[PDB]
Amino acid sequence: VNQHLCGSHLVEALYLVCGERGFFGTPK
Amino acid sequence: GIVEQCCTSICSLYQLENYCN
């Protein structure tokens, strides 16, 4: 099993845990 | 930062959660 979040696994993961709050700023 | 913490090393949920907003 591979524990590192790279690329779109790191992205797909932020989308999950951030929820409505999101990340990469908010517009606005 | 994140890529280092979560891709080069391994990051706990709460590490990962602090790059949100």
Tell me the nearest-neighbour CA distance from B12 into chain A, angstroms: 10
Is residue B6 within 8 Å of B16, Cβ to Cβ? Answer: yes
Instruction: Yes or no: say if B6 and A8 are a contact pair by the CB < 8 Å rule.
Output: no
Domain borders along chain A are 1-27
Method used to obtain the model: X-ray
B4 DSSP assignment:
I
Contacts of A8 in chain B (CB under 8 A): none
Q: Is residue A14 classed exposed, middle or buried when 0-12, 13-18 and 19+ CB atoms within 10 A define those classes?
A: buried
Partner A contacted by B16 (CB < 8 A) = yes
CB hemisphere CA count around A4 (13 angstroms): 9
